[PDB]
Amino acid sequence: AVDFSAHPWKAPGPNDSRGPCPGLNTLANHGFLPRNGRNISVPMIVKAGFEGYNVQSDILILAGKVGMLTSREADTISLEDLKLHGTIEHDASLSREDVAIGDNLHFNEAIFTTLANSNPGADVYNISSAAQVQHDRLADSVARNPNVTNTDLTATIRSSESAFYLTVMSAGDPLRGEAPKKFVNVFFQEERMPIKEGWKRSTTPINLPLLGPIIDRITELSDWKPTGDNCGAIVLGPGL
Amino acid sequence: AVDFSAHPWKAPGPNDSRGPCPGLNTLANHGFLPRNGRNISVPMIVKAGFEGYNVQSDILILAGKVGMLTSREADTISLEDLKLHGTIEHDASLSREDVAIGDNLHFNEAIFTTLANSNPGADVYNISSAAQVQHDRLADSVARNPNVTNTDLTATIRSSESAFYLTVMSAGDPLRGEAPKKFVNVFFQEERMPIKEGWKRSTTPINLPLLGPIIDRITELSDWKPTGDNCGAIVLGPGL
Ligand code: HEM
Ligand code: HEM
Ligand SMILES: C[C@]12C=CC(=O)C=C1CC[C@@H]1[C@@H]2C(=O)C[C@@]2(C)[C@H]1CC[C@]2(O)/C(O)=C\O
Ligand SMILES: C[C@]12C=CC(=O)C=C1CC[C@@H]1[C@@H]2C(=O)C[C@@]2(C)[C@H]1CC[C@]2(O)/C(O)=C\O
Ligand SMILES: *[C@@H]1O[C@H](CO)[C@@H](O)[C@H](O)[C@H]1NC(C)=O
Ligand SMILES: *[C@@H]1O[C@H](CO)[C@@H](O)[C@H](O)[C@H]1NC(C)=O
Ligand SMILES: *[C@@H]1O[C@H](CO)[C@@H](O)[C@H](O)[C@H]1NC(C)=O
Ligand SMILES: *[C@@H]1O[C@H](CO)[C@@H](O)[C@H](O)[C@H]1NC(C)=O
Ligand SMILES: *[C@@H]1O[C@H](CO)[C@@H](O)[C@H](O)[C@H]1NC(C)=O
Ligand SMILES: *[C@@H]1O[C@H](CO)[C@@H](O)[C@H](O)[C@H]1NC(C)=O
Ligand SMILES: [Mg+2]
Ligand SMILES: [Mg+2]
């Protein structure tokens, strides 16, 4: 049971911390996480992701504790902290620029155009369109960023993020790996749950067993290859 | 106010969780951390390390949050969880065996002999002896472990651990980078604060600024070289 009327969307104020993740930013914009985007713990993320999206603790504990590395605090982050390049934040994002050549934090409409224009002739994004977008975004980074980092780990994270927008913003069973364009576009562009537009929280739990085959299929269709060393080493904290 | 007399050493029972770290095990054995070694958060580690050893939050937050990755819980570990190979736990330990050829968890006297016999003719261990021990322990792993991992990261972690025993178990200013053998031996062999033997908590804070030059000097004197892969990629969670 969750009451979305008790969780209205509100635009972030000037002192509200927001990060590179539309998932967490949207939860904050609805007060499932603190609207100020600060002093956020893994337990808070677990609860917020469950209440807002029906995303389960398996993925949120795993990703959450990696995310905690990005702050200087014992057990919390600000959402903006997650911009730390090379922990989770990576090149060839769907809606942000690469840090070496631009802003790796804020939503960018020109970057988002690739996703927005994907799956022409359908009213949904799906696994094949998501894979094509990942292929095109990586090619863009390889072309324009001489410092691009593209590893097994970044590629897996990227497919996980695509799987997230396909599942959390779904109309039908998230298993199907497709989501209305109208829902996904609001998610990214406004960091809002598209309630007025007809979206409802999944009644099916979204967990690693559900996401895994979607992730693997997106990767397979994306015609991916590693770059350089292919070293999957994360940055372990800020300012090292 | 911290009262060391209210923190007696007690040997762990068979179901009290202990890990590969003598620093955290000793805090547990004195009740600065829970004696059962479970349900331990980074704030708890920060407070325990301050109270017991005068180790500051900078290093304990950084290491603590990496250590949290080893459990399946949102914000706690058991001490035994820290044995997870390739997060922090590494080959060429001072007092444990390499996981591929033995027990990477428990104190082992035969391994410890190298450290115990270091700095002949003196009643202290110091930076040069610590470096010699690291050189010899790595050589042992290269000789006997077909799955040996030796990277910049493991080498740095090893120097950090040597810097910890030299500073936390010091008699004089921890700056000096030397510790009585009688104190360090009790620390490793019994995971006890050597209070009866004359040890007292440092009155000087032990933080990254203090440890950094000690760590770097231990590395430099150890005649360390890359041997293979050199990708400092940590394991991000259990059972992946
Ligand atoms: C709650 C469900 C979640 C959803 C639905 C979600 C969704 C997404 C999506 C779609 C992106 C890609 C943005 C892009 O490429 O432009 C993303 C990026 C990101 N997410 Fe999440 N996320 C969730 C949870 C988390 C958690 C728990 C963390 C914890 C650290 C996190 C950290 C990030 C980071 C750092 C990025 C930036 C990666 C990059 O594009 O460079 N997310 N998220
Ligand atoms: C800050 C939180 C801490 C975490 C998460 C942590 C974790 C660990 C881990 C996982 C190991 C095993 C590495 C290996 O040898 O394979 C280790 C070793 C060690 N730790 Fe800690 N530690 C912490 C704090 C401390 C403190 C405060 C001290 C102070 C005494 C300390 C001293 C040591 C020493 C001397 C070793 C080396 C043991 C050996 O090589 O046999 N640690 N630590
Ligand atoms: C992408 C992800 C999930 C969504 C997100 O926004 C941030 C992250 C960062 C950590 C990722 C995580 C996963 O989805 C699971 C990953 C990708 C993990 C690191 C390795 C991992 O645990 C794995 O090897 C199997 O999935
Ligand atoms: C080993 C350590 C501590 C324990 C742990 O589980 C994880 C790490 C990784 C990063 C280490 C950190 C330190 O303790 C301080 C170090 C070693 C740092 C990298 C360089 C460093 O910041 C330094 O002081 C000298 O270069
Ligand atoms: C909350 O975060 C701020 C930084 O935004 C930090 O100064 C403060 O100590 C944090 N509080 C905790 C311990 O949760
Ligand atoms: C990119 O790599 C070059 C070396 O190839 C380096 O000199 C430069 O500083 C890097 N730039 C960034 C932004 O990391
Ligand atoms: C995605 O939709 C397009 C257009 O409707 C279709 O051609 C394609 O086969 C779909 N892919 C998947 C994986 O369903
Ligand atoms: C673990 O610690 C938390 C926080 O103090 C507490 O609420 C919980 O009940 C504890 N669990 C156990 C098994 O003791
Ligand atoms: C360590 O002690 C030995 C023996 O007393 C001495 O020869 C050596 O120079 C010392 N090294 C340092 C760094 O103090
Ligand atoms: C360890 O090394 C042996 C011998 O080279 C090899 O057969 C085995 O697969 C290795 N195991 C690991 C942990 O990779
Ligand atoms: Mg990015
Ligand atoms: Mg070890």
- Sorted by where each starts, the structural domains of chain B and their CATH numbers stand as 16-221 (1.10.489.10)
- A61/B73 CB distance under 8 A: yes
B73 contacts chain A (CB < 8 A): yes
What is the token pair recorded at B214?
């000690």
Q: How far is the CA of B146 from the centre of ligand 12 (A)?
A: 15
Which chain A residues are closer than 8 Å to B75 by Cβ?
41-43, 65, 75
- Using an 8 Å Cβ cutoff, are B163 and B94 in contact? no
CA B69 – CA B84 distance, rounded (Å)? 9
- A234/B233 CB distance under 8 A: yes
CA A18 – CA A22 distance, rounded (Å)? 9
In this structure, the residue with its CA closest to atom 1 of ligand 7 is A126
Q: Please give the backbone phi and psi of residue A135, each rounded to the nearest 5 degrees, phi first.
A: -55, -45
Q: Please give the backbone phi and psi of residue B33, each rounded to the nearest 5 degrees, phi first.
A: -105, 160
Nearest alpha carbon to residue A151 among A101, A216, A92? A92
**Taking CA B129 as the corner, what is the angle to CA B62 and CA B116, rounded to the nearest 5 degrees?**
95
Which residue among A15, A39, A75, A78 is best mutated to probe the pocket of ligand 5, counting the most ligand atoms within 8 A of its Cβ? A39
B64 contacts chain A (CB < 8 A): yes
Query: Chain B: nearest CA to A110, how far in angstroms?
Result: 33
CA B90 – CA A172 distance, rounded (Å)? 46
In this structure, the residue with its CA closest to atom 5 of ligand 10 is B146
**Taking CA A84 as the corner, what is the angle to CA A83 and CA A86, rounded to the nearest 5 degrees?**
120
**Taking CA A18 as the corner, what is the angle to CA A15 and CA A22, rounded to the nearest 5 degrees?**
155
Type and span of the H or E element at B79: none
What is the token pair recorded at B175?
């700056």
- Using an 8 Å Cβ cutoff, are B160 and B211 in contact? yes
- Using an 8 Å Cβ cutoff, are A236 and A69 in contact? yes
Q: Please give the backbone phi and psi of residue A20, each rounded to the nearest 5 degrees, phi first.
A: -85, 0
What is the token pair recorded at A35?
């609207």
Query: Chain A: nearest CA to B235, how far in angstroms?
Result: 9
CA A47 – CA A49 distance, rounded (Å)? 6
- B42/A233 CB distance under 8 A: no
Name the one residue in this structure whose structure tokens are 């863009």: A140
- A75/B72 CB distance under 8 A: no
- Using an 8 Å Cβ cutoff, are A227 and A149 in contact? yes
Q: What Å resolution does this PDB entry report?
A: 1.6
Ligand 4: does its nearest atom lie under 6 Å from the Cβ of B139? no
- Using an 8 Å Cβ cutoff, are B124 and B180 in contact? yes
Residue-level length of chain B: 240
DSSP 8-state class, residue B203 = S
- B231/A236 CB distance under 8 A: no
Ligand 3: does its nearest atom lie under 6 Å from the Cβ of A234? no
Experimental method: X-ray
Number of neighbouring beta carbons within 10 Å of residue A224: 17
| CA-A157 nearest atom, ligand 3 | 1
